[PDB]
Amino acid sequence: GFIGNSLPMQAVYRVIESAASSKATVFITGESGTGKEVCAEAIHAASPRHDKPFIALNCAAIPKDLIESELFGHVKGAFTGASTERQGAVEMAHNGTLMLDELCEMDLDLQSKLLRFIQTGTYQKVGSSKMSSVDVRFVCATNRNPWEEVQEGRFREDLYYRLHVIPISLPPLRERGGDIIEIAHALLGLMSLEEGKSFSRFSEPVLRLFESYSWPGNVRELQNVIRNIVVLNTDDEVKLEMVPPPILEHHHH
């Protein structure tokens, strides 16, 4: 799902092409909305395990105290809400690729257990002493500055240096050249399908604005802007009056 031929993204693609056949852990950083899960899936797709599962553990979408349960599973009655026995994400990912997305959300106690798991594939369901293991290739991602998280004592140093093997620093959208308008056009077609519309072009002022705007929310912000336009309007072309706040006003400062 990567779109873009820009110089810094072609450097990302070279990393992916050369590292994907390895089982080496890839560690992805970049600003919010830069495509870290798309990048992770592209590593999976380029790897020999492309036809096996690609599982993303989205830590910022799981209640913090339940990430362990979601990752490792749990036996019935392990804790107050453990109504059923649960299969962990690690079992879903066996023989495939496991993305630990936004893993700096994990609390220090979970990080201590993760340290075992990433070395051997060994884990226990919450509530149980029984050990199992799985075969997974890791990809990690965070929006945080990992070295700052380690310095402030929020992320384990031993864990970081065993995960941080092949780094990818995704470029922010504002540094991606022709990619902004390439992604915008692809989103215009996708959102047109989603809304039952037919947008395909941008006027010249919109092209200029989108190319120069700093996109502090990166590709998610661009997705939200295109969705806003296609939901609210019906045209073949995006016009400057359609661009939502605060794009124009922030660019003016």
Between 40 and 71, whose beta carbon lies closer to ligand ATP? 40
Contact between 111 and ligand ATP (CB under 6 A)? no
Residue whose tokens read 């072009």: 201
Task: Please give the single-letter amino acid code of residue 96.
Answer: G
Residue 35 CB burial class (10 angstroms; 0-12, 13-18, ≥19) = buried
Cα distance between residue 143 and residue 13, in whole Å: 20
Between 34 and 124, whose beta carbon lies closer to ligand ATP? 34
Q: Which residues of 98-125 are buried (b: 16+ CB within 10 A; e: fewer)?
A: bbbbbbbbbeeebbebbeebbeeeebbb
Question: Footprint of ligand ATP on residues 150-209 (CB under 6 A)?
Answer: 183
The window from 75-83, 114-122, 146-154, 215-223 that contacts ligand ATP (CB under 6 A) reads: 215-223
Task: Indicate which single residue of 154, 201, 220, 239 sits in contact with ligand ATP (rule: CB under 6 A).
Answer: 220
Cβ neighbours for 241, distance < 8 A, ≥ 6 positions apart? none
Question: Footprint of ligand ATP on residues 12-31 (CB under 6 A)?
Answer: none
Contact between 75 and ligand ATP (CB under 6 A)? no
Task: Indicate which single residue of 20, 27, 29, 34 sits in contact with ligand ATP (rule: CB under 6 A).
Answer: 34
Q: How many C-beta neighbours within 10 Å does residue 3 have?
A: 16
Contact between 82 and ligand ATP (CB under 6 A)? no
Are the CB atoms for 161 and 116 separated by under 8 Å? no
Q: Which residues of 161-187 are buried (b: 16+ CB within 10 A; e: fewer)?
A: eebbebebebbbbeebbebbeebbbeb
Task: Indicate which single residue of 16, 20, 29, 36 sits in contact with ligand ATP (rule: CB under 6 A).
Answer: 36
Task: Indicate which single residue of 15, 38, 78, 165 sits in contact with ligand ATP (rule: CB under 6 A).
Answer: 38
Between 1 and 216, whose beta carbon lies closer to ligand ATP? 1
List residues forming the annotated binding site for ATP. 3, 33-38, 220, 223
Q: List residues near ligand ATP by CB under 6 A.
A: 1-4, 32-38, 183, 219-220, 223
